[PDB]
Design a protein around this ligand. Structure first.
Ligand SMILES: O=C(NCc1ccncc1)c1ccc(Oc2ccc(C#C[C@]3(O)CN4CCC3CC4)cc2)cc1
Ligand SMILES: O=C(NCc1ccncc1)c1ccc(Oc2ccc(C#C[C@]3(O)CN4CCC3CC4)cc2)cc1
Ligand SMILES: [Ca+2]
Ligand SMILES: [Ca+2]
Ligand SMILES: [Ca+2]
Ligand SMILES: [Ca+2]
Ligand code: NA
Ligand code: NA
Ligand code: NA
Ligand SMILES: [Zn+2]
Ligand SMILES: [Zn+2]
Ligand SMILES: [Zn+2]
Ligand SMILES: [Zn+2]
Lengths: 166, 167
């Protein structure tokens, strides 16, 4: 017999990403900084390293789209679903899509891209939703307004259960 | 926290299904009986339970269609691909599609819906094709009209969901 094998975790520590396209709502620089800081969330507590590619295939392909955008998990216009990401593996595995019918921001007027991205990359790296209301992996958006981010312990313990500390 | 499981499987044992539309070839009652029996192939050897929903959103949406029918697995007319079903997951995951350019039957003629649906629902539950020519998950159609799930499929499905009541 055969089952559909999943990859619990990436079998390599060095991962690439590519920003395929960009939201209208933020400058290229603000989007780049939001994603780089979202990766640093997980690279700071694990041996994972993340490198940006500008062209060609990367492990984590990042894009903005609306409605039906090429994977038959369509977005739903403003609100509701904000973004989704696929667990580790080849092709669509690791990839992260953000609903460009939301308003993305570097601050608070809209959904903070960094926070949402750091959440989605937890999925890309093999975390499902937490039931802990204080977790980054909790499936509800909250914005504290604090200038500094600290990864909650629940997410630290979940990511390290896969990859260990750095 | 929660990690994703090692195999694509359902994280709940109570699943729902919806017959979204029906083939011209058979009565609604014949179709319902075929799918109900096809689900019993798998519930009989696991702790899984299946409940029919008449509308709205079920875990396993079942539909009949031809050619391009809204995914990356378009059908291809008579024979060839007979049906397909997505592995467990949200949205289209679990769903089962049957090519209505085939002739579906409740007998030995054309393709027996019960048999093909029992195969497809293996996929809906997380089994891929088997290499064993004796298996239900073998990707070549064979009619039988006696039903015992072959051992390869039993071991496959129980590796994911356990045996349920060993009865
Ligand atoms: O799409 C989403 N939800 C709706 C949905 C509807 C249907 N299916 C799936 C999801 C969704 C929601 C939220 C998403 O990302 C996020 C999830 C959690 C947070 C958070 C948080 C904090 O509480 C705020 N501080 C203190 C502790 C943590 C971290 C910093 C931020 C974004 C990402 C996606
Ligand atoms: O579409 C199909 N194959 C062609 C194809 C597949 C994938 N990509 C392209 C084409 C296809 C073929 C068969 C399908 O369902 C079936 C697969 C196997 C069987 C069987 C069988 C038996 O030997 C007969 N008895 C005794 C032992 C077992 C179980 C009961 C029945 C239906 C379902 C789909
Ligand atoms: Ca990928
Ligand atoms: Ca949305
Ligand atoms: Ca066909
Ligand atoms: Ca489904
Ligand atoms: Na937008
Ligand atoms: Na399949
Ligand atoms: Na038909
Ligand atoms: Zn998508
Ligand atoms: Zn999420
Ligand atoms: Zn289909
Ligand atoms: Zn098959």
């Amino acid at each position: 017999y055969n089952v559909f094998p999943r990859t619990l975790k990436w079998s390599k520590m060095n991962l690439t990403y590519r920003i395929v396209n960009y939201t209208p709502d933020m400058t290229h620089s603000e989007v780049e900084k939001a994603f780089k800081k979202a990766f640093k969330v997980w690279s700071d507590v694990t041996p994972l390293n993340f490198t940006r590619l500008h062209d060609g295939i990367a492990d984590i392909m990042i894009s903005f789209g609306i409605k039906e955008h090429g994977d038959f998990y369509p977005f739903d216009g403003p609100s509701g679903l904000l973004a989704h990401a696929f667990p580790p593996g080849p092709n669509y595995g690791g990839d992260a899509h953000f609903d460009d019918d939301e308003t993305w921001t570097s601050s608070s007027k809209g959904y903070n891209l960094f926070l949402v991205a750091a959440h989605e990359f937890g999925h890309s790296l093999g975390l499902d939703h937490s039931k802990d209301p204080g977790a980054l992996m909790f499936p509800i958006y909250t914005y504290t307004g604090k200038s500094h981010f600290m990864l909650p312990d629940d997410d630290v313990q979940g990511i390290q259960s896969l990859y260990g500390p750095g």
